Design brief:
This is part of a larger assembly, with eleven protein chains of ten kinds. Chain D is mainly alpha-helical. Chain D contains one helix and no strands. The termini of chain D are far apart. Chain G is rod-shaped. Chain G has 38 residues and is mainly α. Chain H has helices at 5-10, 27-48. The radius of gyration of chain H is 23 Å and the shape is elongated. The chains are: A alpha+beta (504), B mainly alpha (30), C mainly alpha (342), D mainly alpha (39), E mainly alpha (56), F mainly alpha (81), G mainly alpha (38), H mainly alpha (65), J mainly alpha (34), K mainly alpha (37). Chains C and I meet through helix 4, helix 5, helix 6, helix 7 and helix 8 of C and helix 1, helix 2, helix 3, helix 4 and helix 5 of I. The complex binds digalactosyl diacyl glycerol (dgdg), chlorophyll A (5 copies), 1,2-distearoyl-monogalactosyl-diglyceride (2 copies), 1,2-dipalmitoyl-phosphatidyl-glycerole, beta-carotene (2 copies), calcium ion (2 copies) and 3 more. One calcium ion binds at residues 33-34 of chain J. Residues 4, 8, 155-156 of chain I line the site of one chloride ion. Chain D: It is found in: Cellular thylakoid membrane. Chain D: One of its GO terms (biological process) is photosynthesis.
Chain lengths: 504, 30, 342, 39, 56, 81, 38, 65, 167, 34, 37
């Protein structure tokens, strides 16, 4: 009989049962979305959007609900930290319930289509054989996709009839769902400009409508029909898989580099913001502006939002995880409780020293302090016998500005060393490691996990494309080559054109 | 529990070797 | 139908010493440039400005140490096109900035696409099934994951492999010290598929050569074969009995045997590619958490796993300042991890 | 405005069109001159 | 160095650990040890295994 | 066979060697002079042995800016006096 | 013009000797001038 | 095969299996759209890549505010 | 423990820079390549003996006299992929090559280990390239060297009392 | 009897011509002293 | 209901069972350490 890896091929010439199988797949996926949302709601702590947002908690679907305007719970909370909001039906719970009910309805439809597979609709009226007119189906589906794409852009994203989308400032401090007007100039193609997303959907939508009408009304050229085997459903599988892997590589890239659709308040910051000290630069800018305006050092640092300092910490860098280090970021360094404040290191002479930060590549990193010009002034030595830069020798101290340790100075080498060790991670935080039995080892965020799964699946789908493209174009020989194949068809020079018998 | 798991999988593989050798479908010339 | 397209098709598909095809239009220029770019760079081009390395015969390197090196880290993932905003059309400056790296990687990638299209095109013309092209998906998954996806997940092309013998060795040791890549079960499956493939290659070649039928009088047995002969040149039955009695199992089906020879190394390479996609994001199998918790609390607990991490820590500290010059690392003697005496 | 890199983009585009244009012109020409014998 | 599953190893970290540097190239069969406990401490299983394996 | 002249015919013919006892040495010498004149250094921008460092400098001329990278290299080259 | 005038065994021996000489020069160059460590 | 109300209504939409336009038909027009699409992708790629830099187009989190 | 052995071997012998290990790599990479190649070419030219609803493997019966694929079609394919004379038309020659390539490479791998056993080590180009003044100009060999140093100084961290690791 | 300038001829020379040029260059390099 | 003519029987021979069980068991032996972490 059929080998195990071919069982689903029974559907190739059975459009009704193919629709049933597709309905079942759709039911499973929608059921997953519903179940996943429920599990996330059963585990999500909405009490601290500042230091315990969704991306610290291993939330995967919650940010997708948030991205498109679902921000509140029936229970009264919102992901922006509001209280006493009424989200209406379309809370996270309402979305989850809708997906579960959809799953059930699709399941029932699948049963109907499986039993009543032999519909006249699926028969070619001329031959009585099962047949799908794929070129016209493409136009119909493209037209529908176009209308939906257009409507999503023109009504949902604009807020004209819908909630809009998640938008934020350049430092992910004040994000919320807002209506967004389309950007019709060249900046519409800037990945970081939300208006471009709106313009995309309006414009590609209209194009899809038009192209759909074309594909409904105009038949394929004989030459393309034959070349792409348009009578064979497997050709559509091959090219659809190719489109899907393209889309998957794109969403992996935009997740990793960041865009208007992968906001840092929903997915966490990017590795590149750490690499370029993006948040450290802004923090320093703000502190310098405070000092210029007459604030004391303590006041200048106390004015830094805890949310901003937290982005300037390597524990939130998505390139710090492990493949088998499972779960929420909180399971690693712990649940963040409070900023300790900005640590300023000084030697016995009173010169400010700066701890060298750990790059993402390094699982462990030495503790080296330099002056403002990069000259080494202190470190934690490995070998002690010829040490010259020890904290004990250099009289290194640490003073804190802002946060919970504001105004405090520590001079005892054990304590100063301890804070220097944390300063390699950037800004220093107090963590609750007890609640989750956190193990102290960094995990990636939903930004990292999403990127990984999608780059991997994209690459695997390349194989799927190659395989099904091969099956389509070589259908005639897939049980083997012609047993009567003449040696002259493969012997050199017999035909002038390879494989062409009319060129003897 | 981990050790039990590792040894259990190993023991299954060894049993599999036994069946794959002594209880294989015999090769037959047609 | 007899237009220019079909006339072009005719000429492209002529049976000549080197087949061309429609795929040839992509393949031949891209492969030629990839190879030409490598030979040009390794012969004449420096890596002084991007890496602080000599890398060409011109500078005194040998075949083992020459490379076309990646661009500086500051270039990020710039396409580094000759006419792009970095080189601005200046061929000399383009060479000094590492333009030949993206040149080779990108023409290389399109060339590989061309080669696989060539495999499909020829299979179609000759009337065979396209399993050779299918198998070639493994080389493509490796090239793409390692030379494109990996650096794309990292800070810049700087961390892709540089095209060179010694440079590639550096890439291996970097992956050990930084990613603990030996510990990764996707790399381990790659190793099994490569070594398993080499095993299958050797054992099948040897089995056929040692179960040959006597089809000539010659003591040198190669002439006793004819391409057009109907009969098997060796005994499957005798081969099967031999291995059944030596090893316990044996192939009995030649079609299965040969499919398995495709499956094993192809699957191995595909597995290694998946692991490298994880490494693009530093999503490593670096540690066993249970091991670390135990070792942190118990200074007498030691395994080969903990020993290898010490080696990794040495690799990182000792190689990083010269290997990652854009970081401007200064590690005082006193911070360098070292055991006793050494 | 046409930035220097947009001018660069056009140059790359032109260069590519020329290479592909000239390649196809040449191959078409050769295919017409050196026809396969049929029948 | 711990090599065995019951002494804190998994399949990936586990090993039969080579015999002691104090032994060097000396032949260390079970009967050269004063006890099995000594034999085990000094990595006697490694020699027994690799010598039987190489012969086999 | 595919219609081209056999290689073994070509490379055992007098005419091939009349042509190629000229063209091969000509190419080889042209390659030699490409290096011996120093033109190779100029085309590719490869440092001569005296051009890696200024006399007292021990810091690598690493490119540190993407878009002003051209100028940086030019500045590094000027500093070789 | 005529194929066969210069025997293939001579062409191979001379070409082979040419390869040995050039590779030999490259090995000499490993011990002298640039790349020699000296 | 079974007829249904909705099957009868949709029948015309699945009745032209195999139907083709003669020869090359609209292939050249398709080719132009493919070419334009290739250029479009190249533009958006080179913008994201900072290989194509346009006035008023700041490819950064700091795109505006 | 295998990985430990490999890393320490690299530190002490620079095996990667040793031509016998390089031949070993050519042996196993090539073995895998030729394994996949041979697999794919034989599979590509299987003679049609089955229908689409069954495995093509049933098209071959254990002990049948006739070959199960068309070697002429296989050679016809591969000879055009590269060029005619780079392809084998003789199965005995092909299968000998399949045996010989990995076996000889792996013999060299074995001999690499067995000769580095007596400390004849990989190529050492440490500081091989020097400028006009005498400044060391690093090559990739020198970066390898830095990695090797890390391994060397850290391995068996309590075992060495004297400055040189002589065995 | 045989054509001279064929696809094969072109392929051969795209490789052989630069190869000999490069071998001359690399030969000259062996005489470069720091 | 009138039977579906697209139905096909499915087969897994013993050798395939053995091969499959080996794959699964060996994959489990490989990945198990990582699942326990
Ligand atoms: C299958 C086999 C088939 C055969 C394959 C055929 C080969 C075709 C060749 C295609 C070449 C693609 C090159 C893409 C270059 C790129 O990406 O270049 C990267 C750029 C983004 O640029 C980077 O952006 C980073 C982040 O910047 C942002 O953040 C910064 C810090 O906060 C600043 O704010 C900054 O201003 C802001 O822009 C850094 O600046 C980097 O230096 C910079 O290079 O994105 C972009 O061009 C586009 C990003 C979106 C599309 C990505 C699709 C393709 C890649 C998929 C792989 C994903 C990798 C994930 C890893 C897993
Ligand atoms: C004025 C109207 C308008 C506006 C403002 C936009 C704006 C946008 N478009 Mg839309 N578009 C429009 C009209 C418009 N479009 C029309 C009329 C169509 C035709 C239907 C499209 C079709 C379209 C497509 C197909 C895409 C866009 C994309 C985008 C976004 C580009 C920024 C980005 O993130 O790129 C990121 C994407 C790229 C830079 C493209 C990458 C191309 C790769 C490199 C090609 C090779 C792929 C290959 C598989 C890679 C393998 C190798 C790899 C693994 C190493 C942005 C939202 C892109 C998107 O959705 O981004 C999220 C995108 O892919 N548009
Ligand atoms: C796109 C897929 C995707 C992604 C990116 C995520 C992302 C995330 N999830 Mg979700 N999840 C998903 C789908 C996904 N999920 C599905 C399908 C389910 C149902 C099973 C779940 C159920 C779920 C639960 C219950 C939880 C999460 C949690 C999490 C977080 C931690 C992830 C983690 O630790 O992974 C670890 C990943 C690995 C260890 C990698 C696995 C690699 C496999 C084993 C490789 C297999 C190899 C194969 C056998 C080889 C075959 C070879 C052969 C071909 C020869 C993260 C935000 C956690 C969270 O924090 O919740 C709030 C959490 O508790 N997820
Ligand atoms: C939309 C995507 C898609 C669809 C609809 C199909 C559909 C089909 N495939 Mg293709 N394929 C795809 C993508 C797809 N494939 C991808 C991405 C790859 C590379 C991984 C392949 C590689 C491939 C090969 C090599 C073959 C097929 C074959 C088939 C046919 C028979 C399938 C069968 O009976 O398996 C039955 C499968 C099982 C009984 C169990 C599979 C268990 C898997 C391996 C592990 C668990 C999977 C898990 C449940 C899925 C999670 C979802 C995932 C997306 C995360 C059928 C036409 C076969 C064919 O052509 O027949 C003639 C065939 O030989 N496919
Ligand atoms: C099929 C063969 C082929 C392919 C696929 C490539 C592909 C590539 N080349 Mg290579 N190249 C080739 C042959 C090829 N080349 C040949 C024969 C030469 C010798 C001349 C070169 C010399 C070369 C150099 C020196 C460089 C490249 C580079 C590149 C890359 C960028 C090219 C680009 O952006 O084009 C853009 C152009 C197109 C994609 C053509 C579009 C054609 C459309 C459909 C028509 C529209 C044009 C229209 C008529 C113009 C009107 C514009 C008007 C408004 C002003 C890419 C990998 C660069 C690279 O590698 O940098 C790292 C680079 O510097 N190539
Ligand atoms: C190794 C790569 C590879 C190979 C061997 C194949 C092979 C196949 N493809 Mg797939 N394809 C691929 C990748 C590949 N594809 C990619 C990356 C995409 C985009 C998603 C597609 C999209 C696709 C579709 C939609 C279809 C196929 C189909 C086919 C089949 C027929 C041949 C064909 O159409 O080629 C396509 C041609 C190419 C892959 C060559 C493209 C060369 C480009 C244009 C050069 C571009 C140069 C660039 C502009 C330079 C700038 C670079 C920039 C970085 C600066 C065959 C199975 C057809 C099939 O399945 O029929 C049954 C089919 O319908 N392909
Ligand atoms: C039908 C039957 C189906 C049965 C399912 C079979 C179960 C087999 C086990 C699957 C292996 C995964 C186990 C991971 C270890 C673990 O325990 O995770 C456990 C984790 C949960 O993580 C847990 O979280 C807790 C708080 O929620 C605590 O923090 C725990 O400490 C933490 O372990 O589960 C997951 O995260 C599952 C989702 C993983 C999705 C990642 C996407 C990447 C996948 C792409 C890979 C493709 C590879 C293809 C290659 C070919
Ligand atoms: C006519 C034939 C045309 C066909 C050619 C087709 C093009 C492809 C050729 C690719 C060959 C790449 C090797 C170049 C080596 C080189 O030039 O080194 C040139 C170097 C030059 O020598 C160096 O010169 C410097 C000058 O400043 C210094 O003096 C250095 O000290 C000195 O080492 O020579 C060597 O390194 C000696 C060993 C060379 C042997 C190569 C190793 C073989 C392994 C190759 C495996 C790949 C498969 C190729 C099969 C063919
Ligand atoms: C003569 C040179 C010997 C070199 C070493 C041995 C190579 C062949 C052994 C591989 C064993 C594979 C398993 C058995 C496989 C097996 O059964 O082989 C069988 C095969 C054919 O057997 P026959 O019986 O036809 O011929 C052998 C004798 O009976 C005499 O006729 O044997 C040969 O072809 C021997 C060829 C000798 C000449 C080959 C030299 C090729 C090596 C060149 C070295 C270059 C390396 C350089 C490195 C950079
Ligand atoms: C009937 C009905 C109903 C209901 C329903 C329901 C209740 C549902 C459901 C459902 C569901 C509840 C579902 C679900 C699902 C799921 C899924 C489908 C999943 C999956 C998964 C997977 C696939 C996985 C995978 C994996 C793993 C495991 C690990 C790692 C890796 C991966 C990720 C690959 C109602 C009343 C409405 C009405 C009408 C009727
Ligand atoms: C990049 C580029 C380009 C191009 C170029 C080219 C295309 C080139 C080429 C080139 C070439 C094409 C070259 C060459 C060469 C070569 C050589 C240099 C060689 C050699 C050799 C040798 C040395 C050998 C030896 C040996 C071996 C390996 C084997 C066995 C034995 C012996 C040892 C004998 C263009 C303009 C577009 C543009 C821009 C850029
Ligand atoms: Ca605890
Ligand atoms: Ca001098
Ligand atoms: Cl060690
Ligand atoms: Cl000692
Ligand atoms: Fe075979
Ligand atoms: Mg020299």
């Amino acid at each position: 009989g059929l080998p195990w890896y071919r069982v689903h091929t029974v559907l190739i010439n059975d459009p009704g049962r193919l629709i049933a199988a597709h309905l079942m797949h759709t039911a499973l996926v929608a059921g997953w979305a519903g179940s996943m949302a429920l599990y996330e709601l059963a585990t999500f702590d909405p009490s601290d959007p500042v230091l315990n947002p969704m991306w610290r908690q291993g939330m995967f679907v919650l940010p997708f609900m948030a991205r498109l305007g679902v921000t509140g719970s029936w229970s009264g909370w919102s992901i922006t930290g509001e209280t006493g909001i009424d989200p209406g039906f379309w809370s996270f719970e309402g979305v989850a319930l809708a997906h579960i009910v959809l799953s059930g309805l699709l399941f029932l439809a699948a049963c109907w289509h499986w039993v009543y597979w032999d519909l006249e609709l699926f028969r070619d009226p001329r031959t009585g054989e099962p047949a799908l007119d794929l070129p016209k189906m493409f136009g119909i589906h493209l037209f529908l996709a176009g209308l939906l794409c257009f409507g999503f852009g023109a009504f949902h994203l604009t807020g004209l009839f819908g909630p809009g989308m998640w938008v934020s400032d350049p430092y992910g401090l004040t994000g919320s769902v807002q209506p967004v007007a389309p950007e019709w100039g060249p900046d519409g193609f800037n990945p970081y400009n939300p208006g471009g997303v709106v313009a995309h959907h309006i414009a590609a939508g209209i194009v899809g409508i038009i192209a759909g009408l074309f594909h409904i009304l105009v038949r394929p050229p004989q030459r393309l029909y034959k070349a792409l085997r348009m009578g064979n459903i497997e050709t559509v599988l091959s090219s659809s898989i190719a489109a899907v892997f393209f889309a998957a590589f794109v969403v992996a890239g935009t997740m990793w580099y960041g865009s208007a659709t992968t906001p840092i308040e929903l997915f966490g910051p990017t590795r590149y913001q750490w690499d370029s000290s993006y948040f450290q630069q802004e923090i320093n800018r703000r502190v310098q502006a405070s000092l210029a305006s007459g604030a004391t050092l303590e006041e200048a640092w106390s004015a830094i939002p805890e949310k901003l300092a937290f982005y300037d910490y390597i524990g939130n860098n998505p390139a710090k995880g492990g493949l088998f280090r499972t779960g929420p970021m909180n399971k690693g360094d712990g649940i963040a409780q409070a900023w300790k404040g900005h640590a300023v290191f000084r030697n016995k002479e009173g010169e400010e020293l700066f701890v060298r930060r750990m790059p993402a590549f390094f699982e462990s990193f030495p503790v080296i302090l330099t002056d403002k010009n990069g000259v080494v002034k202190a470190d934690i030595p490995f070998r002690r016998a010829e040490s010259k830069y020890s904290f004990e020798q250099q009289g290194v101290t640490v003073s804190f500005y802002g946060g919970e340790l504001n105004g405090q100075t520590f001079t005892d080498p054990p304590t100063v060393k301890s804070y220097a060790r944390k300063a390699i991670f950037g800004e220093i935080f107090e963590f609750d490691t007890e609640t989750l039995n956190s193990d102290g080892i960094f995990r990636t965020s939903p930004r990292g996990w999403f990127t990984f799964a999608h780059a991997v699946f994209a690459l695997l789908f390349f194989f799927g494309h190659i395989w099904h493209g091969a099956r389509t174009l070589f259908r005639d020989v897939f049980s083997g080559i012609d047993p009567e194949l003449s040696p002259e068809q493969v012997e050199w020079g017999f035909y002038q054109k390879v494989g062409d018998v009319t060129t003897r | 529990m981990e050790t039990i798991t590792y040894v259990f999988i190993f023991a299954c593989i060894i049993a599999l070797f036994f069946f794959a050798i002594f209880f294989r479908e015999p090769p037959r010339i047609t | 139908e007899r237009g220019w397209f079909d006339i072009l098709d005719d000429w492209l598909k002529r049976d000549r010493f080197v087949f061309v095809g429609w795929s040839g239009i992509l393949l031949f220029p891209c492969a030629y440039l990839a190879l030409g770019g490598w030979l040009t760079g390794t012969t004449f081009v420096t890596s002084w400005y991007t890496h602080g390395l000599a890398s060409s015969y011109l500078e005194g390197c040998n075949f083992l140490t020459v490379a076309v090196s990646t661009p500086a880290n500051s270039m990020g993932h710039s396409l580094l096109l000759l006419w792009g905003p970095e080189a601005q059309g200046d061929f000399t400056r383009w060479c000094q900035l590492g333009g030949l790296w993206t040149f080779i990687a990108l023409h290389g990638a399109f060339g590989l696409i061309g080669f696989m299209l060539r495999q499909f095109e020829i299979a179609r013309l000759v009337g065979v099934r396209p399993y050779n092209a299918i198998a070639f998906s493994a080389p493509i998954a490796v090239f793409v994951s390692v030379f494109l996806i990996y650096p794309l997940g990292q800070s810049s092309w700087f961390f892709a492999p540089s095209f060179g013998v010694a440079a590639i060795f550096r890439f291996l040791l970097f992956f050990q010290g930084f990613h603990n890549w030996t510990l990764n079960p996707f790399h381990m499956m790659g190793v099994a598929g490569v070594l398993g493939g080499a095993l299958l290659c050797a054992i099948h070649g040897a089995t056929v050569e040692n179960t040959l039928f006597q089809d000539g009088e010659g003591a040198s047995t190669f002439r006793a074969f004819n391409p057009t002969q109907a009969e098997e040149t060796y005994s499957m039955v005798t081969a099967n009995r031999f291995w059944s009695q030596i090893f316990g199992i044996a192939f009995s089906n030649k079609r299965w045997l040969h499919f398995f020879m495709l499956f094993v190394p192809v699957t191995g390479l595909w597995m290694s590619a998946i692991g490298v996609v994880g490494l693009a994001l530093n999503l490593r199998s670096y540690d066993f958490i249970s091991q670390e918790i135990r070792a942190a609390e118990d200074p007498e607990f030691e395994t080969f796993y903990t020993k290898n991490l010490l080696l990794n820590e040495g690799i990182r500290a000792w190689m990083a300042p010269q290997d990652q010059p854009h970081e401007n690392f200064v590690f005082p003697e006193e911070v360098l991890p070292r055991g006793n005496a050494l | 405005t046409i930035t220097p890199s947009l001018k660069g983009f056009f140059i790359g585009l032109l260069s590519g069109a020329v290479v592909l244009g000239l390649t196809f012109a040449v191959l078409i020409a050769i295919s017409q001159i050196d026809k396969v014998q049929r029948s | 160095v711990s090599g065995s599953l019951l002494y804190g190893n998994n399949i990936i970290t586990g090993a039969v650990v080579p015999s002691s540097n104090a032994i060097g190239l000396h032949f260390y069969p079970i009967w050269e040890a004063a006890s099995l406990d000594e034999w085990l401490y000094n990595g006697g299983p490694y020699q027994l295994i690799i010598f039987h394996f190489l012969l086999g | 066979t595919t219609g081209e002249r056999p290689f073994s015919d070509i490379i055992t013919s007098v005419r091939y060697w009349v042509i190629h006892s000229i063209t091969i040495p000509a190419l080889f010498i042209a390659g030699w002079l490409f290096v011996s004149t120093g033109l190779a250094y100029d085309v590719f921008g490869t440092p001569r042995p005296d051009s890696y460092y200024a006399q007292e400098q021990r810091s690598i001329p690493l490119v540190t800016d993407r878009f002003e990278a051209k100028q940086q290299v030019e500045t590094f080259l000027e500093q070789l006096k | 013009s005529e194929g066969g005038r210069i025997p293939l065994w001579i062409v191979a021996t001379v070409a082979g000797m040419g390869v040995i000489v050039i590779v030999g020069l490259f090995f000499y160059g490993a011990y002298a001038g640039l790349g020699s460590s000296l | 095969a079974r007829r249904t109300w909705l099957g009868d209504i949709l029948r015309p939409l699945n009745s032209e299996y195999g139907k083709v336009a003669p020869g090359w038909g609209t292939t050249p027009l398709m080719a132009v759209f493919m070419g334009l699409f290739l250029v479009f992708l190249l533009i958006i790629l080179e913008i994201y890549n900072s290989t194509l830099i346009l006035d008023g187009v700041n490819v950064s989190w700091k795109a505006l505010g | 423990g295998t990985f430990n052995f490999m890393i320490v071997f690299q530190a002490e012998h620079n095996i990667l820079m040793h031509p016998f290990h390089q031949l070993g790599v050519a042996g196993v990479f090539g073995g895998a390549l030729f394994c996949a190649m041979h697999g794919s070419l034989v599979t590509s030219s299987l003679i049609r003996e089955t229908t689409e609803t069954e495995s093509a493997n049933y098209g071959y019966k254990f002990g049948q006299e006739e070959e199960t694929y068309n070697i002429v079609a296989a050679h016809g394919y591969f000879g055009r992929l590269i060029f005619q004379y780079a392809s084998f038309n003789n199965s005995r020659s092909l299968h000998f090559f399949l045996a010989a390539w990995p076996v000889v490479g792996v013999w060299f791998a074995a001999l690499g280990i067995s000769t580095m056993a007596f400390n004849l080590n990989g190529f050492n180009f440490n500081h091989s390239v020097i400028d006009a003044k005498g400044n060391v100009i690093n090559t990739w060999a020198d970066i390898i060297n830095r990695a090797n140093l890390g391994m060397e100084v850290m391995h068996e961290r309590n075992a060495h009392n004297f400055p040189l690791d002589l065995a | 009897s045989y054509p001279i300038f064929t696809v094969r001829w072109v392929a051969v020379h795209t490789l052989a011509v630069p190869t000999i040029f490069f071998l001359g260059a690399i030969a000259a390099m062996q005489f470069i002293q720091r | 209901m009138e039977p579906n003519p697209n139905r096909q029987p499915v087969e897994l021979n013993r050798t395939s069972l053995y091969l499959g069980l080996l794959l699964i068991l060996v994959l489990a032996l490989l990945f198990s350490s990582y699942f326990f972490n």
